């Protein structure tokens, strides 16, 4: 509260470490469904159904231009990618499996780096 603060958690490396994690996700073999924004002209249903599209290229641009205020808003957009994928894709499809795999991969790196 006013003039009463918990001790300062060191956040000075958060930008570098989120960038490293994102690099690891960009280079994973199962990242191909997620590298670029879904083409809303060419994929029926996507525009109407998926209210907040997100992809790794868009996260990388946001990260590079100071559009994440803190590491939690970064994790929210990464998870959005996988939540969108589960909304639109059957679990037993190549893309559906890719998204499960990537979410698992991310969540381990996230824990190992920050928790």
Q: Which approach determined this entry?
A: X-ray
Report resolution in angstroms: 1.6
Give the dihedral sign, CA 19/24/27/30.
negative
CA distances, 65 to each of 49, 69, 111 (Å): 28, 11, 25
Distance CA(75)–CA(59), nearest Å, equals 10
Q: Which domains does the chain have, with CATH numbers?
A: 1-115 (1.20.920.10)
Compute the Cα dihedral for 51, 76, 56, 65 and give only its sign: positive
């Amino acid at each position: 509260s006013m003039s009463v603060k918990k001790p300062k958690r060191d956040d000075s490396k958060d930008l570098a470490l989120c960038s490293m994690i994102l690099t690891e996700m960009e280079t994973h073999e199962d990242a191909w469904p997620f590298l670029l924004p879904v083409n809303l002209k060419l994929v029926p249903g996507y525009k109407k159904v998926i209210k907040k599209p997100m992809d790794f290229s868009t996260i990388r641009e946001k990260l590079s231009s100071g559009q994440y205020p803190n590491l939690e808003t970064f994790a929210l957009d990464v998870r959005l990618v996988f939540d969108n994928c589960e909304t639109f894709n059957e679990d037993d499809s190549d893309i559906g499996r890719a998204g499960h795999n990537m979410r698992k991969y991310f969540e381990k790196k996230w824990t190992d780096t920050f928790k």
